[PDB]
Symmetry: D2
Subunit: 257 residues, 4 copies
Amino acid sequence: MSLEKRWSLKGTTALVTGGTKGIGHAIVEELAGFGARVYTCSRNEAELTKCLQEWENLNFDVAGSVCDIASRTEREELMERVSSVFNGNLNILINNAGGYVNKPIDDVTAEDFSFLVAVNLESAFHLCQLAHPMLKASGRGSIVHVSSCCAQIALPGHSMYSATKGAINQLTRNLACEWAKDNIRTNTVAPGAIRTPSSEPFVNDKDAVAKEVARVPLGRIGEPEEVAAITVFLCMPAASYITGQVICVDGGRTING
Amino acid sequence: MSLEKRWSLKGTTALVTGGTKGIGHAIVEELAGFGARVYTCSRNEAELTKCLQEWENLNFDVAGSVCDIASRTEREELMERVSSVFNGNLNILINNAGGYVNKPIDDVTAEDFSFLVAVNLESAFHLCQLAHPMLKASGRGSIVHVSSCCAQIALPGHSMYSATKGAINQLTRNLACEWAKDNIRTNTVAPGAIRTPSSEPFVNDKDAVAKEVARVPLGRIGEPEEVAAITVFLCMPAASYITGQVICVDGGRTING
Amino acid sequence: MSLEKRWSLKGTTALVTGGTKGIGHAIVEELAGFGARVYTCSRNEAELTKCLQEWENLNFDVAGSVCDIASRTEREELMERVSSVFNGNLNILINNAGGYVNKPIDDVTAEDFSFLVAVNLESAFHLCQLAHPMLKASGRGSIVHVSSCCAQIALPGHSMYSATKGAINQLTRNLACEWAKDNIRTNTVAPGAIRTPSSEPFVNDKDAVAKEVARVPLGRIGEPEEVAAITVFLCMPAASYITGQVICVDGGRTING
Amino acid sequence: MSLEKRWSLKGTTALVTGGTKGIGHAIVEELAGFGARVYTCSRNEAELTKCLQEWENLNFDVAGSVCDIASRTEREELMERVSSVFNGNLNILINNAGGYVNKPIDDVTAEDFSFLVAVNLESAFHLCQLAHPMLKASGRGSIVHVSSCCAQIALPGHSMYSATKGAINQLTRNLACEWAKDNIRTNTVAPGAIRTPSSEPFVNDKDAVAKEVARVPLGRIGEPEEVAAITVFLCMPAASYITGQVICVDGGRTING
Ligand SMILES: NC(=O)c1ccc[n+]([C@@H]2O[C@H](COP(=O)([O-])OP(=O)(O)OC[C@H]3O[C@@H](n4cnc5c(N)ncnc54)[C@H](OP(=O)(O)O)[C@@H]3O)[C@@H](O)[C@H]2O)c1
Ligand SMILES: NC(=O)c1ccc[n+]([C@@H]2O[C@H](COP(=O)([O-])OP(=O)(O)OC[C@H]3O[C@@H](n4cnc5c(N)ncnc54)[C@H](OP(=O)(O)O)[C@@H]3O)[C@@H](O)[C@H]2O)c1
Ligand SMILES: NC(=O)c1ccc[n+]([C@@H]2O[C@H](COP(=O)([O-])OP(=O)(O)OC[C@H]3O[C@@H](n4cnc5c(N)ncnc54)[C@H](OP(=O)(O)O)[C@@H]3O)[C@@H](O)[C@H]2O)c1
Ligand SMILES: NC(=O)c1ccc[n+]([C@@H]2O[C@H](COP(=O)([O-])OP(=O)(O)OC[C@H]3O[C@@H](n4cnc5c(N)ncnc54)[C@H](OP(=O)(O)O)[C@@H]3O)[C@@H](O)[C@H]2O)c1
């Protein structure tokens, strides 16, 4: 296969959960920029409609609908709309939307626990199950979860958040092996500190980011499109021999002494 | 500190969940053999009473009560009995009891998901929270989760089971870092195929174990006391500089090509 | 930067060691396909000349000279020619050329040891040293080592080969952290079994292929351009936040139980 | 086997390279404390003689001879003496003695490279080869390398040192798999900062200590016997199912964000 084909996504369809802000927003534009048809979602109808209007002016083909992926019913309705819009053919699934709690281990409540598990673990797992017939039908499927580099080290207050992301890391390996017979590859991008609306409060704390950036060899927090780039590459045919891998996008955070 | 003291557990107290069968049963006898006072539990009153009667004849000091660690209420009652029996001083917590489901990813039900998470992840997490005041009060605390070597590789049908065990692996690192100030170390033993009542059906399938043992460099399945030995060592003062680690007890399974 | 600029190597200069066959040949053509001026080498003058002739006819700007990277003097002369050709401005360094010995541990000779160390480890380390001033001068530097997925698992007869590759994996982390101040990133691509002239004896052993393929979830040996694609991506500005990582390109080999 | 027999080295024979100071000295006394007949070595005749005199007075059966493990001829003469002393029956091989250089990557000289490779990598590999017939003859063999926790992260000035130790980590996996048929297990203990005569310049730099201690969850540098304890455990029959593992002994250093 030629270079132009191997580095292209024209004629592919993709689903990105939580694509109205930050990393997921960058992933949607990065996928559409390489010729993919993108479907996304969020919980805010006004914000989602503004983004769909913005992407239309950029000549992108992006559809979407309101969906809280922490609800089993709404995950099923979402995959039913995706299956009808894309005619049951889905090439790409990006499990981007997540949830975050920053509390010491003693302070994690029962509701904190179930919230993180529902949005970070059960949602991705169920969406993979629902996507399986469509990924197999497309002929070339690519699942990319976005996890966190703190699923390999210990950060203060990240216990249950990092634990759910660690489960996602292992789920990557099971999916890659079980669904290899369906020509479906599964990988994970694990970001470090990235400038998103969710990381804004931490970013506006001068003393907090100074502690963080000092641990980063590249000496800065990452940008959303620095995560979206590798995410998109893993979905290209050029990555046809890469499956089951956890790629850290952290500027060297986790490997730094 | 002398060699005899560093390799001893005399004068310590321990809690082992699910200590009536298999690995947990071996852990209880291994802890008691080194002079520890052991508290354990299971869901079967008759079987638990027989084990407590057996350990009494072996001159062990083992107490216990019926408890389903998948229930939040029963976990709280258990830690209240442990706190009264041990006078609020607990040195060792062994999160041994677990749950297992063997199904392809497509077949994992919503009830399969919540069952595995409750017994493998939430129970261990909550029991650590409840044990924290007593571990800090003892002056030298040791938490050991028992996970699985399949939280680092992909085995058929192990998806959600391995995913919960992967979360346990990351939780080890958070606990070791957050509670280091309380002189509490946290580690994890990750067993391979071990001869227990739970692994019996797989063990009695000649073709299935032949596939498994062929992947094991040592050419056999492990015994329960091969897991209990390292578990006990991690609780001794000799392991005083080992914390946050995931030790695989698999006969070389996961590192074998 | 825009999408077009982030996914481009236009205006860059690169060095690939061993680009006349196999993976290195795929990397050269992949780099030039994205607009990079390439310099390559090998030990065979006639073969390198034919490659340079072929690449010029494909309108690539690729230069080359004969060099045995296992020779310190020839590594210095190589980096001297690269400096004059590119005017002391080098963006990319790909350490591809290596050596291989398949013998049990009892059979590895002292000459086998020193050969594997010289070609797989010392060459890459020294070339990084000699390239450091030029990479810093470019303003945007990217080092990529080609290691092996068997640096994480044990394959029969791979002991010393995998040991040197394991040393490469660690060197990646040191290079990423020490030279991040110079705007240089360092990563590593660790391939599985790839169809190259070196692997030809392994590929023509139908029994040995079937044994290896059975352990690969994707059910096949990789192709050279499947390694070259991710190699080139790690050199693009799109990978600006990825450093110190070892990316296994093996079709799921190392994570398949 | 019973508890007493599984946690015993009575009747065993061991070899520790570099047992006159620091970690190796702790390993010798720890092995003999459990009943093992030990053989050790160093490059200083007077110091080794005093150690042998001290160990005899403590009623240990420890023998020794002068040997520079960086010399192939002296490694062969060493293993020749070990064979006659133990009558060709060797249970345990501890590769403790090593070398260290702290320089930035730009400053590592060709002599620094070859020195680190010879003492940290080639010595251990060759000694394993020479010990293989004796370990197989013992009927129960155990190899333990002493690597470093910095073979998983990047510390300033550790590049080549950590690279050789990273090679040791991989060699552990090959040795465990190739020699499992001979009833030989191979594992690795990877220490953090330990109070040894070698680390004395680092320990007497109050600024350098505080910088390192701040990254250690346990908030202190380790002690030699904290490394020796787990080293001895991996040689006991109790560890019969543990092989091919790298156990970090660093107080949580490598997993602390
Ligand atoms: N520093 C970092 O940013 C960082 C570091 C490590 C890992 N990560 C991971 O990277 C991923 C991206 O995170 P982010 O930083 O972009 O912030 P985020 O809050 O995880 O992403 C927010 C986007 O997802 C949507 N969303 C949130 N919860 C949702 C739900 N339950 N159902 C449907 N949509 C939902 C949001 O829209 P609405 O709020 O309107 O629903 C918004 O469009 C996350 O999974 C996170 O765990 C981020
Ligand atoms: N091959 C293997 O055996 C293997 C491999 C990898 C990992 N592991 C892990 O090693 C650990 C030990 O497992 P195992 O093989 O000994 O079998 P297991 O079924 O996990 O352990 C059973 C013991 O725990 C008790 N138990 C089970 N569920 C419980 C609950 N909800 N509440 C309280 N007690 C409970 C059982 O008593 P009752 O049933 O009477 O309650 C029994 O005493 C598990 O966590 C498992 O995940 C085992
Ligand atoms: N299955 C696989 O192919 C596989 C698997 C894992 C890792 N790898 C790694 O991936 C890399 C690519 O290997 P490959 O299979 O492409 O090898 P290959 O097909 O034999 O290619 C070797 C290339 O490097 C050149 N070369 C070899 N030794 C050299 C030296 N001392 N100095 C200068 N040039 C030299 C060769 O040219 P001359 O021979 O004319 O000098 C040739 O152009 C290697 O580092 C290998 O260790 C490969
Ligand atoms: N902070 C740490 O201490 C630390 C951290 C990470 C890893 N490590 C590793 O742990 C191991 C223990 O190091 P250590 O700190 O105990 O070193 P040390 O205190 O300097 O002990 C060195 C011992 O080995 C002997 N020795 C050194 N070079 C030798 C050679 N070429 N041939 C024969 N014997 C030799 C020495 O005796 P002579 O000098 O009289 O020959 C001495 O008995 C080393 O492999 C080291 O790389 C240590």
